[PDB]
Amino acid sequence: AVPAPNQQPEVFCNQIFINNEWHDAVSRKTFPTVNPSTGEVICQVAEGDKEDVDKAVKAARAAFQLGSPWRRMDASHRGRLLNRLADLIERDRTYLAALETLDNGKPYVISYLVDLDMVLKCLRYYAGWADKYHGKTIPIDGDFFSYTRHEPVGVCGQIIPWNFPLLMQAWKLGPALATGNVVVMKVAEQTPLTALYVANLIKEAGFPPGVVNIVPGFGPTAGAAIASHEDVDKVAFTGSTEIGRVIQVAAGSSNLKRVTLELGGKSPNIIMSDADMDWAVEQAHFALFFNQGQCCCAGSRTFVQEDIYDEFVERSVARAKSRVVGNPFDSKTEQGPQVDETQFKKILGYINTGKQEGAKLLCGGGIAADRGYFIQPTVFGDVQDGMTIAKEEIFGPVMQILKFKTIEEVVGRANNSTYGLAAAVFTKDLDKANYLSQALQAGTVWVNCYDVFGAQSPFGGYKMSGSGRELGEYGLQAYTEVKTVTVKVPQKNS
Amino acid sequence: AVPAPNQQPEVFCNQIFINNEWHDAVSRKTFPTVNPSTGEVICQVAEGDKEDVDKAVKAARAAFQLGSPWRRMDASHRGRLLNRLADLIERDRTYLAALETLDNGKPYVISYLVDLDMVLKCLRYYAGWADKYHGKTIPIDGDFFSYTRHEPVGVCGQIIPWNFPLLMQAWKLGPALATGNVVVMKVAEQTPLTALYVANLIKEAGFPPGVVNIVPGFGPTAGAAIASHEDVDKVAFTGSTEIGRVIQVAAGSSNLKRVTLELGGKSPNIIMSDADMDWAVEQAHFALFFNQGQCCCAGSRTFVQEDIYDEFVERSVARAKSRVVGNPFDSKTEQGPQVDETQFKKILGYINTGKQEGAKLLCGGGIAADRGYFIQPTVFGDVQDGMTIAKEEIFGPVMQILKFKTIEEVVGRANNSTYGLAAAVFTKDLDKANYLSQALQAGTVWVNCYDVFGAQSPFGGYKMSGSGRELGEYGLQAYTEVKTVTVKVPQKNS
Amino acid sequence: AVPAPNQQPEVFCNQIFINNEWHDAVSRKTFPTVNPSTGEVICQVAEGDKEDVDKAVKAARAAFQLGSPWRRMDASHRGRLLNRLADLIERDRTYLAALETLDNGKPYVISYLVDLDMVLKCLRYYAGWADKYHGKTIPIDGDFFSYTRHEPVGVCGQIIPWNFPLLMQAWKLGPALATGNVVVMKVAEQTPLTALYVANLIKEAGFPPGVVNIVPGFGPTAGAAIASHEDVDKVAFTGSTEIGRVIQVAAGSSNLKRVTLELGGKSPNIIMSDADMDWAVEQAHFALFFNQGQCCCAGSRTFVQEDIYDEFVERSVARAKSRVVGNPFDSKTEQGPQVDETQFKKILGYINTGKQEGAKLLCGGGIAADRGYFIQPTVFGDVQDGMTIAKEEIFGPVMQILKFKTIEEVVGRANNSTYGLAAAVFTKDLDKANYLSQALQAGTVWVNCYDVFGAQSPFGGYKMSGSGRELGEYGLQAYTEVKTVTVKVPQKNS
Amino acid sequence: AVPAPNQQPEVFCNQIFINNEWHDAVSRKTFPTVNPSTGEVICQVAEGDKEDVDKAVKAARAAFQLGSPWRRMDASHRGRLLNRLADLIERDRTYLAALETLDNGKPYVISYLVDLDMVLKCLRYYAGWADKYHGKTIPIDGDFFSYTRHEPVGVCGQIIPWNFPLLMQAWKLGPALATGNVVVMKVAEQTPLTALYVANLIKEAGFPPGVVNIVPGFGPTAGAAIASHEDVDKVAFTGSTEIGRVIQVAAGSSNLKRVTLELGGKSPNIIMSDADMDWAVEQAHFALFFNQGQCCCAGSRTFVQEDIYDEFVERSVARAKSRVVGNPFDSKTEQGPQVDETQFKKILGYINTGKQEGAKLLCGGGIAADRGYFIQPTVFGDVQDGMTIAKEEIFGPVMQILKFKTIEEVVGRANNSTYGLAAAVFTKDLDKANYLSQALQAGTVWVNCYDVFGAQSPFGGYKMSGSGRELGEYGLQAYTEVKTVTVKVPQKNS
Ligand SMILES: NC(=O)C1=CN([C@@H]2O[C@H](COP(=O)(O)OP(=O)(O)OC[C@H]3O[C@@H](n4cnc5c(N)ncnc54)[C@H](O)[C@@H]3O)[C@@H](O)[C@H]2O)C=CC1
Ligand SMILES: [Mg+2]
Ligand SMILES: [Mg+2]
Ligand SMILES: [Mg+2]
Ligand SMILES: [Mg+2]
Ligand code: NA
Ligand code: NA
Ligand code: NA
Ligand code: NA
Missing domain, CATH: 3.40.309.10 (Aldehyde Dehydrogenase; Chain A, domain 2)
Known part of the structure; x- marks a missing residue:
């Protein structure tokens, strides 16, 4: 049972998303995105570059400051927000499925029954993890109380490909947000539309400004700016093995940001x-x-x-x-x-x-x-x-x-x-x-x-297919920074 | 209660350790290691380089082959082997503490009461983890049985510094061996002696040939050969922030091997x-x-x-x-x-x-x-x-x-x-x-x-001080490769 | 900001709930529930006894049969149902808070802001656990693949007190349903109303018939029938230390059903x-x-x-x-x-x-x-x-x-x-x-x-205050039956 | 390769073991234990009853007091002691296997190759768990820091059968001691010898007095005294379904002590x-x-x-x-x-x-x-x-x-x-x-x-075959009492 599609869905979002607002690129440049079924231009999209990435990273860093709304929010509430986002995506399921097909080319029936269904299940699964990824209390030697805090890794740069636009966005946002991180996402130049619309839903859901920022644009420009940024704490990338190497090299050459890769x-x-x-x-x-x-x-x-x-x-x-x-x-x-x-x-x-x-x-x-x-x-x-x-x-x-x-x-x-x-x-x-x-x-x-x-089972590669795992409880590991707190106590007892 | 130290302990091992045997460098070159308390040369040590690293990696890879003694060994037995290594180190405690002091300079009382004690506790702690780092059975949607196998990452390159020679070696060997990996370790040119002697104990403890290989030598030579090797699956490094960058770039430029770093x-x-x-x-x-x-x-x-x-x-x-x-x-x-x-x-x-x-x-x-x-x-x-x-x-x-x-x-x-x-x-x-x-x-x-x-509590850095954690249960994460197995079943029930 | 209460809320449910249907007690007897603020009777309620408990247990057992809708339902879907039930409770929050106060006596402002809030939080927290309580894959000695399945304990009898009618029902239903069990709940004779209305919401939410059964009535009759039932697999009780003893003795004297207690x-x-x-x-x-x-x-x-x-x-x-x-x-x-x-x-x-x-x-x-x-x-x-x-x-x-x-x-x-x-x-x-x-x-x-x-942190007693824990991940332990599956394999490798 | 057995091993221990000392029963009564192969009496054994159990419980309680050697001991050291005990049992393997056969009747080849091997594996497995059963740090709502301490349940009464005398003792002692509990064990009247000799080894290994106490004697006397004792916190029983019922009723009728059962x-x-x-x-x-x-x-x-x-x-x-x-x-x-x-x-x-x-x-x-x-x-x-x-x-x-x-x-x-x-x-x-x-x-x-x-995989029954699980990580659950500590903090941040 599939609702009849609008074969020419209207495009409402085609700019850079920062602090819950829409912005043109600083250069005012735009690039066309094409409908692969006809070879015709759908519309133009703001072409983000380094300067735009810089604004997005500063916004993400600000939303991550100690005492900020996003940092103080109860973990359970982050879960509520993810569930709300999922409900909004479901409300707009028919429209999103058609826009996905228009920009990407996959059959509408599949975008609707597969892609969207999986996006909803991924977000709802991770909403449930928000307040359950516990740290530990450890029976260390001596008169001490030792425990760990599972804190957010921080500003997370997420670079995604074009084969599953909406689903790749969800696979990245779900675990990152469930654990309280902030995001600067770079969507594929071939399929930027659906992710930008979802940004509107992120604002509608109630996420504080700067928690999720999306910069459409090209790879060597916007993508590389994220990988090499001195204030990006972690980068997650899905795409070609060739660019995976470029990303890991950029991470090592800049600030040693943590890296996870999903290659072919x-x-x-x-x-x-x-x-x-x-x-x-x-x-x-x-x-x-x-x-x-x-x-x-x-x-x-x-x-x-x-x-x-x-x-x-x-x-x-x-x-x-x-x-x-x-x-x-x-x-x-x-x-x-x-x-x-x-x-x-x-x-x-x-x-x-x-x-x-x-x-x-x-x-x-x-x-x-x-x-x-x-x-x-x-x-x-x-x-x-x-x-x-x-x-x-x-x-x-x-x-x-x-x-x-x-x-x-x-x-x-x-x-x-x-x-x-x-x-x-x-x-x-x-x-x-x-x-x-x-x-x-x-x-x-x-x-x-x-x-x-x-959404419950991890996925990732051995050898050159990547490092790290997405989905399941494992998908939360790369989004967590572990802090050990060891306190001297009068007399430790079992 | 500290035993009298041999102020000039005899050196028994000063070569490259591969397949439980001692080898001179392919080049036949050696480098002097000095006693920092006098500035005098203690002895010459084989100067390992790329070719020696290549021999070590090949030996490690062979020992890691499916069906090999190391791969088939019960997990509990890997634990027995680690406990046996600990017992051998304890037997030779007085000697190792003196050798540590001679090559590194730290007070003998400290080498004996602190370093050696911590080496013993680290190995014994990890011995206990050998058969307890469980995979999961996952309640995935649909008629399937899904589970994860926690497998070893493979050939692990381990580059360590000179500040705590023996302890750094144990921090690396403990988790790596507990999870069934094989190792190619590059010890610091300033302090290679104690780690080499421990290689002798590893052979005596009964670890299969090729499971642990040690290549003494310099950084830009032996170290870089490991970091850039096409057949090393993971590299763990402890040292300067400068070289930490070099290691991550080498990994990205080569085969995308997994990387963990502990910097200053x-x-x-x-x-x-x-x-x-x-x-x-x-x-x-x-x-x-x-x-x-x-x-x-x-x-x-x-x-x-x-x-x-x-x-x-x-x-x-x-x-x-x-x-x-x-x-x-x-x-x-x-x-x-x-x-x-x-x-x-x-x-x-x-x-x-x-x-x-x-x-x-x-x-x-x-x-x-x-x-x-x-x-x-x-x-x-x-x-x-x-x-x-x-x-x-x-x-x-x-x-x-x-x-x-x-x-x-x-x-x-x-x-x-x-x-x-x-x-x-x-x-x-x-x-x-x-x-x-x-x-x-x-x-x-x-x-x-x-x-x-x-040994129970994790340690590692935020920002530029490193990525990943050592010690505790967390220290096992970087030494594990996760495999998901999803099987179609007739009818899934809770 | 609390909505004006209806100081005389209408009662819609006052019977025994079995298989998503309302039934009078087999005896046709009823008992009065009093408004403690006035001392007047609110209404009559079906007086469930042993025969009614027997019908409830048979319905629960049927709903738990292998191949049933509840058993085959995706774990993630049990989560969706818990979330739907929470949404319905929130829709009727004002009404339920008023009914709680009427039957129990607590201030309406507290019923609304505290009790109902915690009910929503508890159900939503457990909805997230439905597809995340993993079993384990275990590295046992020998040529075997060994793993554990976390299965539902089965037909769970749940006896609750009158101090927090709605919250106590939620504390019980949340973990039980998240793990796929079926329930026969015996609500306090002093405060049966709110729980009975929630039963109507359980039906509206879509839970299969027989998954949750509620039998209002007295303790020595309905309560004891559950504790001594030969087909109830587990009993959870909250109340006096005196009755806690009676419960444990009844469990031991009957079928050795599992028991958890929360006393004073x-x-x-x-x-x-x-x-x-x-x-x-x-x-x-x-x-x-x-x-x-x-x-x-x-x-x-x-x-x-x-x-x-x-x-x-x-x-x-x-x-x-x-x-x-x-x-x-x-x-x-x-x-x-x-x-x-x-x-x-x-x-x-x-x-x-x-x-x-x-x-x-x-x-x-x-x-x-x-x-x-x-x-x-x-x-x-x-x-x-x-x-x-x-x-x-x-x-x-x-x-x-x-x-x-x-x-x-x-x-x-x-x-x-x-x-x-x-x-x-x-x-x-x-x-x-x-x-x-x-x-x-x-x-x-x-x-x-x-x-x-x-809902994230466990609660329970030491000594005679009880055994077992409710809330948190720990709250799932008593609702899970562990099965080990050990399979002979051709050749075990790490 | 099995060492030739002594077909008539000498008996060294045949009394009640309390505070690391051997005692006659208060009544001075003894009972004969028979060699089932010949029908002849091996020796007399102290017949413990309620009064002896009382002395044992007081010794265990004293050994469990806050600040005692056993309570202050580092968890890692508890592991060292279990490993030491295993080493002593291995040293005396030939003797124990022969004594097991003498008192129980099983083939010596099996006692040596199976029972003793499993005892060693069980104790060494649990030694490893001593410092690894972590509590949790929980992301509760509001400005609080909430965590759990995994404490020992306390004085544990352990009643075991005669089919695998040494193995059943190990299955009980391993998890109990790994978690810091104290024990009052009632061995089977048909096979008390091997367990008593092991008590000598427990003393030799260095366990503090009172940590392990063993009371040989009959069931309705010594066993029942343990089950009904007002100062025993938990009872673990293995035997007939009939007595399992008796144990659970005794627990409920006394102090509501925690119970686990392994029946037929x-x-x-x-x-x-x-x-x-x-x-x-x-x-x-x-x-x-x-x-x-x-x-x-x-x-x-x-x-x-x-x-x-x-x-x-x-x-x-x-x-x-x-x-x-x-x-x-x-x-x-x-x-x-x-x-x-x-x-x-x-x-x-x-x-x-x-x-x-x-x-x-x-x-x-x-x-x-x-x-x-x-x-x-x-x-x-x-x-x-x-x-x-x-x-x-x-x-x-x-x-x-x-x-x-x-x-x-x-x-x-x-x-x-x-x-x-x-x-x-x-x-x-x-x-x-x-x-x-x-x-x-x-x-x-x-x-x-x-x-x-x-030792890695859990074992226990469904239905009337028992409750709870032994072995594996699960075997530690019944020996742990969970304490939640919730602290008010200035401002909670993720
Ligand atoms: N689960 C198992 O592995 C075992 C099951 N059984 C079953 O039990 C049947 C009868 O054998 P029994 O030796 O009589 O087992 P039993 O259950 O009566 O005795 C086992 C242990 O419980 C103690 N015990 C006996 N009566 C007690 C009481 N009133 N209160 C507290 N502890 C008490 C015994 O002294 C011994 O230490 C066997 O034929 C077999 O079917 C027997 C041994 C082991
Ligand atoms: Mg490309
Ligand atoms: Mg340098
Ligand atoms: Mg009463
Ligand atoms: Mg009997
Ligand atoms: Na396109
Ligand atoms: Na030196
Ligand atoms: Na009432
Ligand atoms: Na006997």
Whole structure:
């Protein structure tokens, strides 16, 4: 049950958000954001740069001052505010889902039923943590009373990508606000609209000015200004491995701010011969193609045991050929366009790369429409470990199917990667599942399922896929600064 | 009750430790380690460099392979091994305390009663954590069973300083080994001997080859090779803020290895007018002069309330004048030499700066002996916040005494620093203690005490004094990689 | 800012609540509930007995069956339902606060600002815990995967008193529902109305039928039927020490159901000579007189240091003399009537005993009105430890002031009691505060405050004041049944 | 590799242990303890009664007074003492194993390799918990600092059975001492020797006098005196359901002391048709026959799916017939005698009942030797749910094999019991394992294994099999009394 969408939602927010108010960039510069389904400009947005970031950081620092409304507010009340924000987002769910689709390209039905639902669940989950992340009382040696206070890390710079605009914003705001930090968020230049509207809801919810500040703009400018800022205490980043390095270097070169990163991957989806065929085929399709293939944890290396390889491939190809590509506002559409021209070209390049290196093109492989950035669902068979399409994140509707013989062999091949964000195993056998979940070097291992996220379960990468974890109780660790208080007492007793 | 020290303990280990074997450097080069009390060379030590680090990392990686003895060992058994190492260290306590003094300069009585005791307590505390750092079972939405596995982060690079050679080594090995990680440690060129001898005990305790590897050598060579290694998963560093930046940049520039840092500070020790005079004077003396002033958390900014300033200063000067400086092996010696000539000259430079900038030299101020690196206990009065000696870490027996009037004033002055490792408050008033402990921006706030460490309580810095925490349950966080396993189940029930 | 109350609120619910439906007692019998301010009957209420409890238990058991809506419901959704129930209670806040006052006697202003506020806070706090009480993954020896599931204890019998009708219902429902249990609640015969209306809100909120069942009626009938029921898995009781014994014996004699108890106390409020006089006097007054003295943790033993005894007593008498007793619906009323005639007479009897035993009657001591159960605020001075009023819980507006000399002395006298629910310490000294808080044998120790409750902090008794804790994370322990699952795996690795 | 046993170990301790000293009973009475293998008296043991328990409780209370050596001792030192005790038990391992076998009857090889190993592991595990069971710092509403202290519950009465004398003592002492409590232990009259010798080791290890007191004697006398004592704060009991009831009633009728119970069971072991036959048969044999069938969690209801029933039974009967019964000191003996004449007769009675009720006797069924309490390994086939041997705990070498058809059917049958201590599932299917482990109403569910205990994983029963959990972190909960300290502060900040 999905409410009919407004296929041309009006844009109400397109400026820089600081101290609960809207501002043009100091330079007065604006940049166009494009609708990927048509290739047309939606509207212009204030182009924030260093000077704007400076104003936002000063506002955040002021809201974080000892004795301020945000610092004195009961933890339980921060929880109330998050719950209020969630209620406001739900009130505007239909509008937000349509705006998300307009700026990003994902199907409206998905923006509505998936993205928005997950935003609401993330915020509501974290609202509950606001007054429950306890410090400790410690039985230290000697005549002392020792305890720890879980204080906020402080001014948190949050840089997010364009694949899940609203959800990425919620994943960042939820834990940061639940623990009493203040935020300077830099949204993606490709999808700034939905996050800016949410800023209006943050003000409406009652958050004190300066608690959340949003600066739309580009990376090397606004993003880098946050990473290198001398008064930003912590930075959280989700995006490319390349920029992840740039961020960590900027943090180390400036004030040693704390850093957490969520980068991409080349996640292996292992299908054992005893797996439920119909289920594994559908889930492998979902694992790769979901969100136009623009998922950090996309199952981009589909390993299939030799005995079921031929049948698995045949079914996967049929499924890929039936996938409906089109207007994301049409209910029948399964796949919208890629986010922008840059990604579009990059994917075309990877497809040509696959053909050049000898991977068997089974279907698709080309542009799916004249207007917009639509690419045909593409499947490569007989992919080998050394191929570039088997190693690098394509971030498009391009599936790699690899053949394997033994469970010991597949463990080694799946783990032979600098990435380690996620992995999956499809099998009916108890021992195979436990052997593989333990052996796989990945942040999340799904068993007989894929892309199953819960606000309660942590997510993050091993190796080069990132550091730190988001979601769950773990998502609060990077937003907390630990203080030990040790007091001399007359006579310590147990 | 301290056993007679061997004033010239024999050196048994002076090479690179890899796979439980001793190796010369690939280059065959060695460097001299000096006795700071005489300025004479104790012995030569293998000079490890990049190639030696590469050998160590490969050995560590092999020992960490799935199915290896270290990976399969019961968690409780890792605890047994840590307890066995502790027992071996206790057996060789008299010898290790003397060797520590010889290479570092600290008083033998202190090496024996403080350093060795703390090494033993740290290892025994962490031995207990080996089989108790649980993952979680999570009530995720939908028909799934979700849980987390707390796995070891992997190959851990550990770079440590010279101020507490043995203790720093135990603070690093304890949590790392308790959680099943493998180590490549780079000890300080000024004090490599005791850590190398402990490597012999690690082998004797029964730890599998490659679990702990030690590479003595210089920083820009061996240290940087670890920080920039493509196969090191995590790096923990303790030392200068300058090198802390270098380490974080190296991590970002290489493989995005996880990073934790423990840097210096300029910790404020606050004496309110209602403090117990005698206690505060002795504690402030200890707070600054302990370990030849070579403590990351030295109370180097002694703020004294105006009403008790004159008396506090008088008593402090008397205590500093009575402090016995001399041969560390003599039972009457309270202060040994500084670690090396570089530190020695750096401190004298700071003292000359203090004099030039207008601080009032109350006592000391010069060299304490013709041989070795001895410096007279120095006290500066009427110190102002803008003075060099009030801003920069001196790391020597140089005390700064500043005057203040109000509690709000002292809070602001204490917090006006880029450092935030520790702080202390001496007062008899409940409210003043609670106000200050909450307001101070420091990792550890001591109340009516100073330098009170316990393996049970975390330690680390705010701001530029570091990131991450060591000791306590918190010390296990940076040594754990979290994996989420989400399994589809027939029908989830509470 | 309190909304004008309806001094004669209409009663909508007065029957037995089972399976989201209203039922008359099987016997068809009813009992009157009286307005303590006038002594008149408000209305009749179904008199539940054993047969009614049996129907309730069967309904709860059915709702708890594996595969039922309540068992399969996402933990996060149980949280949504608790939040919805809180929203409904807030919508009807004015009405419920009035109904509470009518049936109980407490001032409407307090019912509204305190009771209803705490009910909302408690339900909202527990709503947040619903999907966060994790089980554990455990590093057991051998080739096994071991973990724990935190399952609901099951059918929970909850017997509550009349002093805080709504709050007590919330304290019970919150943790029980957050953890997925089902409830058979027996409300006090003196104050059944507000809880019965909340039952209507539980249905409106959407809780499945049978999840919460409420049986109004007497103790030896309905109460005992629950405690002795062969199919009730856990019983939680709040009330007299006498009935607490009966409950534990019934549990042991039946099916060994789990038991938690919150009984009375004779809590010591200790005023040191260095305390803030004005604050201590007002807080000591509140500590004893709050809610007509009908608080389990009432500071009924006011220990005052000899140097400030006279002045403290004088100020306390003046405050007690000016305390407004009258119609609870009038905004100026500070104290309403005692709950019923039985309590009224028992309190007067204690006052008579106090006079007989030699305590100095300083003010009050008799009936405050001709109609209703109003008693004058009474203060006894020079009370001795051996006096009946110094040992037994009076549960009325009767204050005992005792004199002491030393801190060591007061610890012994404060601890010489079979009760140990709470205690307080008023002092400006840090060491005295820590010395006493550690030494006092009580579940809650307040320092420079009293009756400070938070849904985040646990509450419960030491000794005969009870067992187990309510509120906070601890409040979930007694509502969870722990299951260990240990699975054989091919090869265990860290 | 088991050291040759002394088949006639000398007895050194046979009196009441109070204040680290040995005492005769006040009455001077003694009782004989018998060697079940021969029926002959080993020696006389002091017969403790109420008066001796009173002396013990006073000693424990004195040792628990604020300021005493035990109360002031650093928590880490409590860990050192537990580790020291384990070292002494390990030193005397061969002796203790032989004495255990002599008094209890179990094979020496098992006493040595299993019981003693588990005792050592349990004590060393808990030694590690001594300084790690943290309290909390809580973000309560308002201007307050609120935290909890995890204090010792106090004087703990521990009543243990005769099936695992040394292990049961360790399971009780480990958590109790790790948390700073004092103990009054009542060992089983059938097996008092090993526990008494351990008391000598407790003294040798350095535990303060009164911390551990042991009173050998009968149940209705010494045991009941502990359960009803007005100065015992908590009682932990392991034994029959019948006495568990008596204990809880005694607690409720006396001082409302806290209670935890570990009672019997009639644990179901479910073999699905897809199970590994060889492994399932061996494990089912072990599950039932381990320790002469004297295990609380014995797999006494072996459910076997119909398709594999015939083969499973034939293999089971073959294994039972080959089980070697004889002198427990002989290396080839798998089964020793039952603990005493009472159990011996009770088991023969259950066998008679099995024959009378129509269960198919497949092997054994009678006495296995003319001297000693030896019983033949007995197997009953075609057992039905309504049979006495299918419902009551036999506690002997008598196996019940039942046939089932579907997974839904077996869940209902397995759960249709007033017991719920443990259960097991043997299957290769991932879904069947998860479905069953979730559905079974038991404290511990083993998958493809049985009797897998670890000091790290909790153990306890559902329903009438008990309340509370032992082992793991959970084992510390019942030995902790929670105190909330809430302090008024000038201004609370996050
Ligand atoms: N859960 C278990 O592991 C065990 C269960 N049992 C069950 O109990 C059945 C009967 O064996 P029993 O030796 O008679 O067990 P029991 O429950 O009577 O005695 C066990 C312990 O409780 C003490 N005790 C006995 N009567 C007491 C009383 N009135 N008050 C306080 N303590 C008392 C005993 O002296 C011994 O220390 C066994 O056949 C078996 O079914 C027996 C041993 C262990
Ligand atoms: Mg880029
Ligand atoms: Mg340097
Ligand atoms: Mg009564
Ligand atoms: Mg018995
Ligand atoms: Na766009
Ligand atoms: Na040296
Ligand atoms: Na009433
Ligand atoms: Na015996």
